[PDB]
Write a protein that binds this ligand. Structure first.
Ligand SMILES: [Mg+2]
Ligand SMILES: [Mg+2]
Ligand SMILES: [Mg+2]
Ligand SMILES: [Mg+2]
Ligand SMILES: [Mg+2]
Ligand SMILES: [Mg+2]
Ligand SMILES: [Mg+2]
Ligand SMILES: [Mg+2]
Lengths: 52, 117, 63, 104, 88
RNA sequence: AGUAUGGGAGAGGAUGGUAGAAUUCCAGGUGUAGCGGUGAAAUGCGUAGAGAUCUGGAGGAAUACCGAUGGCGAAGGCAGCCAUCUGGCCUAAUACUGACGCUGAGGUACGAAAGCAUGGGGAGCAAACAGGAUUAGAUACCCUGGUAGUCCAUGCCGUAAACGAUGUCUACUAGCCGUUGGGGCCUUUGAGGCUUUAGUGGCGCAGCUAACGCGAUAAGUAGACCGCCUGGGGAGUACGGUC
């Protein structure tokens, strides 16, 4: 999971842009942490929105 | 004098009062009403009825500009947020969309202290 | 939310759908949370209680 | 020398000057010593949110191997280059040469 | 941060036998090298108390090893301190 | 007990930069009567135009979601993103030293918040203080404002229900169910099932306990060293000394 895989990043983002919890999505701890980091990087680089 | 076909409606709903301001696009104001201003000046300002009356009067006032379709943005908590859109529909505006715009700080400023009542 | 409305959508049903979308979003609880500042010790105690309740719920379901 | 990945956003009006700036940056790495493993130009893209009232920007990504000097020199070039609007530098272990998604 | 080549050179200089990496001479030489290296860092960061604890641990371990070597054989201890330039 | 070499996870520490949301204030546009607050009110703000909405600007402080009897650190404690310097921990095999170890009176290092000295900064919150309410009285709880402080640099201060109310180290003593970081083995439908190790949780046999309860993370069975207590008040007080 990288910051350049916008499709898989979107698959774990709600309509409002918030990050879905692991308990709901079904992922593991390491993947969840890596993917949160990737989402933050993409938000900074403006590939994905912060909100809305 | 001015004639506009489409506009926006802003509902500032709080725990003590509800303000309904109908503006044009780009945010220039056209009409505004308040639950407390439209009578019901007491603890009843926060009741849904006052919000409905405010929305009705605001819509009737704004009808002079020939607005038929409205977009609704609702801000914050408080009873009467739902009543405003119902009153707008009753007075006859066609609601294109309804959206929520309540601000959410990302752990910014420190809020006030807890009340001990 | 951005609940776009169909041509024949009634206002009441539209408002019901908007309320459902807002409930799913959870903005109201976030707004409530920031009304008063809560101290870190109280927050930690609340989270501990929540975790204790959650584990008991899981065990009860498994039983 | 360590491995670095650099992503740059460029103002659209200076999109024609991107070739010169990338060429100069590459020449600096090569003359210092360095090793340039990847260089991709994603092209114009609409931003998720406006930055400085700009709604579209040109994206350029590059993977290089260099030293601390070459580095701080490149960061100060990006600092003082007006065309560059936002940059991200991530350290990496070992070099990546495979074509990346969003290439074109 | 000392490198693998530097550590290997130190071990080659102070090795008493082939594949000897656990002798007091080699251990004390490596500890002395790393202690000297960290001094540069600790002027640039006077308030890195968390790392200063590891530095103090290194110093204590070097002292224990030197005491053991001195107790078991004086000539080796004197030669080691002379080569490493340490007071005691 | 320690050392060399390959991998792994982490809000561990220090210095610099940077990004988004929000509050406050300042100008401009639309626009005209309330806004705000409580149990109800009132003080306060507004027709030299408030509140509401839109555009632009200034500055400070903290980093939503992820987030989790999750993680790391000797303790205190550590949360956005990126770079630089840097400590510890886990994990496989081989190869080295050969008891090099445990504890620790004095001593010494670190040590939340508040407070202190110098210089800077100050959005929001807020001791003190002022006003409006409640009450028989209100020096309070409630409401409207609001200073020190909370922030930064360099030092001092040595304190907390600084708590697991449980000093450190070592060996042994039924089982069952979670979860975090690794090692190994077996199936296939690409994710599962068994083991072992180091952490972190829920039950529970024996044993222990005045009882409550603890129970391989012991308060069980044994060893080594240290600190501490001897009815309740006077009292962590006076005198003397040190800082
Ligand atoms: Mg209040
Ligand atoms: Mg000791
Ligand atoms: Mg007050
Ligand atoms: Mg500092
Ligand atoms: Mg004490
Ligand atoms: Mg504590
Ligand atoms: Mg005690
Ligand atoms: Mg005293």
């Amino acid at each position: 999971i990288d910051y350049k895989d916008i499709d898989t990043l979107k698959q774990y983002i709600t309509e409002n842009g918030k990050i879905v919890p692991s308990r709901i999505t079904g992922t593991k701890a390491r993947y969840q942490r890596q993917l949160a980091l990737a989402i933050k990087q993409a938000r900074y680089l403006s590939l994905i929105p912060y909100t809305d | 004098t001015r004639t506009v076909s489409e506009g926006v409606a802003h509902i500032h709903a709080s725990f003590n009062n509800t303000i309904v301001t109908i503006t044009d696009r780009q945010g220039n104001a056209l009409a505004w009403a308040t639950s407390g201003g439209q009578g019901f000046r007491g603890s009843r300002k926060s009741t849904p009825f006052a919000a409905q009356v405010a929305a009705e009067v605001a819509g009737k006032a704004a009808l002079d500009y020939g607005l038929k379709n409205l977009d609704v943005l609702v801000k914050g908590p408080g009873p009467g947020r739902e009543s405003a859109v119902r009153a707008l529909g009753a007075v006859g505006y066609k609601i294109n969309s309804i959206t929520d715009v309540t601000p959410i700080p990302h752990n910014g400023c420190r809020p006030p202290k807890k009340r001990r009542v | 939310p951005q609940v776009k409305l169909k041509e024949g959508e009634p206002v009441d049903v539209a408002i019901r759908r908007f309320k459902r979308s807002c409930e799913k979003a959870g903005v109201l609880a976030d707004v409530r949370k920031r009304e008063f500042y809560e101290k870190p010790t109280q927050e930690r105690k609340r989270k501990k209680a929540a975790a204790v309740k959650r584990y008991q719920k899981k065990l009860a379901r498994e039983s | 020398m360590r491995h670095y990945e650099i992503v740059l956003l460029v103002h659209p009006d200076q999109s024609d000057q991107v070739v010169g700036m990338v060429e100069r940056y590459i020449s600096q790495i090569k003359e210092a010593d360095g090793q340039i493993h990847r260089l991709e130009d994603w092209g114009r893209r609409q931003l998720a949110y406006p930055i400085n009232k700009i709604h579209k920007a040109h994206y350029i990504l590059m993977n290089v191997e260099c030293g601390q000097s070459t580095l701080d020199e490149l960061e100060e070039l990006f600092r003082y280059n007006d065309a560059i609007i936002r940059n991200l530098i991530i350290r990496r272990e070992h070099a990546i040469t495979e074509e990346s998604l969003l290439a074109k | 941060a000392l490198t693998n080549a530097d550590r290997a050179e130190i071990i080659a200089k102070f090795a008493r036998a082939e594949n000897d990496t656990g002798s007091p001479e080699v251990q004390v030489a490596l500890l002395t090298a790393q202690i000297n290296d960290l001094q540069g860092h600790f002027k640039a960061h006077k308030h890195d108390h968390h790392s200063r604890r590891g530095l103090i641990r290194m110093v204590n371990q070097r002292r224990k090893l030197l005491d053991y070597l001195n107790g078991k054989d004086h000539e080796r201890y004197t030669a080691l301190i002379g080569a490493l330039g340490l007071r005691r």
